[PDB]
Amino acid sequence: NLDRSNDKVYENVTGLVKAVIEMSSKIQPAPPEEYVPMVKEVGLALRTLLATVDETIPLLPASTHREIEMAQKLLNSDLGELINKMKLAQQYVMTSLQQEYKKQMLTAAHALAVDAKNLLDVIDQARLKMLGQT
Amino acid sequence: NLDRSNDKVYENVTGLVKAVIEMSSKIQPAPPEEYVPMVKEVGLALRTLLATVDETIPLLPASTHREIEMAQKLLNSDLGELINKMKLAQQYVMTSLQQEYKKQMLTAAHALAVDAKNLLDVIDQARLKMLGQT
């Protein structure tokens, strides 16, 4: 029934609940079934990054195209490994093997963020070359 | 140096990193020291909710002011208990007691969300009375 369009009480209660839920999801480890969507999000954000990079390559010196092309390939690879460990981890849910598969998951994810940051670094250095820094 | 104002590569890499970090914070349990800010957020959102409710009471039948006033008092109370268990949990960080104190934390937090939802319910029922539902 009720219209919540400018129902601040309803808004502020949704906010308090959301905050209790971020707090609890962060204190707690997630049920393997609840991390497919999370890995899905990671996948999207990477797919978007790679598209953007694809459209930046042409404006940067050819002298650099390959180093960047390699940094891209490695990111796709890391998502490879991360999807792997994720499936293994769903497989062993509730067993004595579940823990070691979360850890190989975090390691794969962490490697992806480190290699994404390295991608920024190669691309900024190519940007600094076209712009002509001393 | 570089201006990131419309640097989409930098934007998309921050996004991929943020997503890896939400995924990892959610798979993993948080270091007791990292949940003060989280409980702080919960506190703010509740303080805002209670302010909004304070400003809605006068427009709803006096016949209901007290039930709502009690639901407010209980929310403040639950934040009471939640801050307690949080401090206890920081206290016992790395000990054999740390776990049981996270659980009493999640229980307190969860009780707060349930009692916040009940606050919406009392207030919607008071709204349905002023508006004149059949």
Partner: peptide
């Protein structure tokens, strides 16, 4: 309250 209940149901 259907979206708020997606949330209330998230705490089980």
């Amino acid at each position: 309250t259907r979206e708020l209940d997606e949330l209330m149901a998230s705490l089980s």
